Ligand binder design. Structure first.
Ligand SMILES: CCc1nc2ccc(N(Cc3ccccc3)C(=O)c3cccs3)cc2c(=O)n1Cc1ccc(-c2ccccc2-c2nn[nH]n2)cc1
Ligand SMILES: CCc1nc2ccc(N(Cc3ccccc3)C(=O)c3cccs3)cc2c(=O)n1Cc1ccc(-c2ccccc2-c2nn[nH]n2)cc1
Lengths: 399, 386
């Protein structure tokens, strides 16, 4: 009798029609669907719950099922006439009506405000400011090898991953400016969508390599790079496959705009939205932060286990300052984004059903995304512009 | 006691050191290797069998094992001190020790230079004074022609460098500059070839302005970043056994075999594997959309000619670049210690200057394959769409 369970009854029986052999299978499935459609029409969605029945958005909700039951009756007509392929063709029009629901009541469509209502002129400006500043500081990192170590190889790969990540900012600023109207074709929606995720993870995984490398340099003062570097680009490539698979241009009917969305299976759209959001947290923040934090306290342990003289005290704390800066910068730049992503996942799970909260997440998200790119501006100062001085202060305490 | 069986004993124990947990495993393996190295030093190879022991090539053979036993003793020193990762690092230098002119080539290089330069001259000059800066696909054509033109412009250098039996007479600064200029325009060519296949595919699957202002700089940016490890490692170094100053890939000598194997894999993945994935997927992507549309009359002749133009861009790229990357992958396996037979290593050396020429020959194919024959692809794609 629940709305979510009735859509499951509608989508499971819609699959039966596609793989049906005889007209009796189609008729049976459509009879179950007509019952579920009328039962779902009586239900009230979790979003716009405390809403009057005479309201236009509640009258539109029940109207959607009048269209749906009408399409079911046209397919039932054909099934009873013994017209299987005709009924299966008529039943395929139910998907168009089902998609008009998932982009309205299932999501923050008929909940949170439209992009036109939440458009700030500062966002495209801020995105170009971080683009030119971040692009020029990573140009220094790369050209610094020309005018002048296994660790240096990870620096270059980090600078390349950062420099290609920041190179996508002119696209998102343009896409935001045209109120989410993708004017580059659906092919570049998959390609640059994947290219973004590829270099984002390549940045985060090479940050993780640096902490493991600096830790292994502290605990053990004393071919690995020629296999770890291709492997880091391999894992970033595999982590960016769900982006290539689901990113696609789809027309948002109530906005009349072609948006580069995450075109998930409509029959399990909330499940996928919640699932992929958890993948972002675990794979992009939780797991790399476990490594970065463990390597910090791992280094912090060994420096409090060597010597405590006054001359070697200054040298010890400056190594710890460089060590605490790589963990704090990663948290400040990526924690706001993953907090909003975890809250977003709870909204798809049905935990958060407040449009006030969901609206906060929507307007905060373009800013939280910018801090993620801002981490690529910080990396030159954390690793390249310190690596030359971190090495001599680590050899001083070791002697 | 056989030389082949002693090298098998040396290679099997190297696999033990890599996967060793404790210093005793490393010490045990190196003790078996020191025995196998001294036993192999006493053996005479099948080649240069009927050769005097006082001969320089016989003294060099036994000298190679004196270097090999030396590195084993340096590793045994660390293993006995309880330095596992240090001993495993020292034992990896044993691989470097284990791995240890045609007049037609400079002529052929100048033939491809003048033919390729003149075919890209007709394309560059066409776009400016006899056409215009309109259309999006035409912008990639011009950038491809510029990248090809500048790539073919380096052929007089490699022909001269080959003529002086690899004696770089231009200074170590131009070894880094033209070395990177070569790689820059090589990747700029391959990446704009990749753009063309993605553009033609997007024109087929979606028959219905901004994208060009962003992609052209992004492609040249990725070309500059791909040619940086070239600028950092290419340098002039004296090759003692040839007595010549060669413009080589000056990797750290203590870590030369790992770097040579690593950068060879970079060439295959970034310069052939990844771009070929795009070119092949866009071909079968186009091939899919045309075959699902039922053609049978005049439209069938129109459909197959579009497929002929489509199959020509993937086949030309494979014919011109696959020989080079096959030899590069085999070269990488030789540095990894996979390929031990010097006969196939000698084949790579003489087959490499020819395989490099086919790479430049792809820049002779691109003007015909996209600007000239590719102009009909525009008219014949709108005919099947209508
Ligand atoms: C800082 C890096 C970053 N830049 C972005 C730039 C733009 C946008 N936006 C929204 C936007 C548009 C214009 C201005 C401002 C915002 C988009 O619409 C598009 C994204 C990809 C193609 S279009 C989102 C992001 C954005 O979420 N991130 C972070 C991030 C987190 C997680 C994943 C991820 C991990 C695992 C599996 C799948 C994904 C996954 N998420 N979205 N696609 N793929 C990818 C990226
Ligand atoms: C067709 C394009 C091409 N022209 C070349 C012209 C000459 C030579 N040769 C050998 C030679 C000399 C004289 C006559 C004939 C051959 C050289 O000694 C020099 C090369 C660069 C400065 S000197 C090699 C090549 C050659 O390998 N290639 C292909 C190629 C493949 C891969 C990379 C590459 C990718 C990623 C990272 C690094 C590199 C990288 N390899 N060498 N430096 N940088 C660059 C180029």
């Amino acid at each position: 009798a629940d709305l979510e369970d009735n859509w499951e009854t509608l989508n499971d029986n819609l699959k039966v029609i596609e793989k049906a052999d005889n007209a009796a299978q189609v008729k049976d499935a459509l009879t179950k669907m007509r019952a579920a459609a009328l039962d779902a029409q009586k239900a009230t969605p979790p979003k716009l719950e405390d809403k009057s029945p005479d309201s236009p958005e509640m009258k539109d909700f029940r109207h959607g099922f009048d269209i749906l039951v009408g399409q079911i009756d046209d397919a039932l007509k054909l099934a009873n006439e013994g017209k299987v392929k005709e009924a299966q063709a008529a039943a395929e029009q139910l998907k168009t009506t089902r998609n008009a629901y998932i982009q309205k009541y299932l999501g923050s469509g008929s909940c949170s405000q439209k992009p036109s209502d939440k458009h700030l002129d500062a966002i495209p400006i801020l995105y170009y400011i971080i683009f030119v500043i971040g692009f020029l500081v990573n140009i220094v990192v790369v050209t610094l090898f020309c005018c002048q170590k296994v660790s240096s190889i990870y620096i270059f790969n980090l600078a390349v991953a950062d420099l290609l990540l920041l190179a996508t900012l002119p696209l998102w600023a343009t896409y935001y400016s045209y109120r989410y109207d993708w004017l580059f074709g659906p092919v570049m929606c998959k390609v640059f969508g994947s290219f973004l995720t590829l270099n984002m993870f390549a940045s985060i995984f090479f940050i993780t390599c640096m902490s493991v490398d600096r830790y292994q340099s502290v605990i053990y003062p004393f071919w690995q790079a020629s296999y770890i570097v291709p492997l880091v680009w391999c894992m970033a490539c595999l982590s960016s496959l769900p982006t290539f698979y689901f990113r696609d241009v789809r027309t948002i009917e109530y906005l009349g705009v072609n948006a580069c969305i995450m075109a998930f299976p409509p029959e399990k759209y909330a499940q996928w939205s919640a699932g992929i959001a958890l993948m972002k947290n675990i794979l992009g923040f939780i797991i790399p932060l476990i490594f970065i934090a463990t390597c910090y306290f791992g280094i912090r342990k060994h420096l409090l286990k060597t010597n405590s003289y006054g001359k070697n005290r200054i040298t010890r704390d400056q190594v710890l300052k460089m060590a605490a800066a790589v963990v704090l910068a990663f948290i400040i730049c990526w924690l706001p984004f993953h907090v909003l992503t975890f809250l977003d996942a709870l909204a798809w799970m049905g935990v958060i059903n407040s449009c006030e909260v969901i609206a906060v997440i929507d307007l905060a998200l373009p800013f939280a995304i910018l801090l993620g790119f801002t981490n690529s501006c910080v990396n030159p100062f954390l690793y390249c512009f310190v690596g030359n001085r971190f090495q001599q202060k680590l050899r001083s305490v070791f002697r």
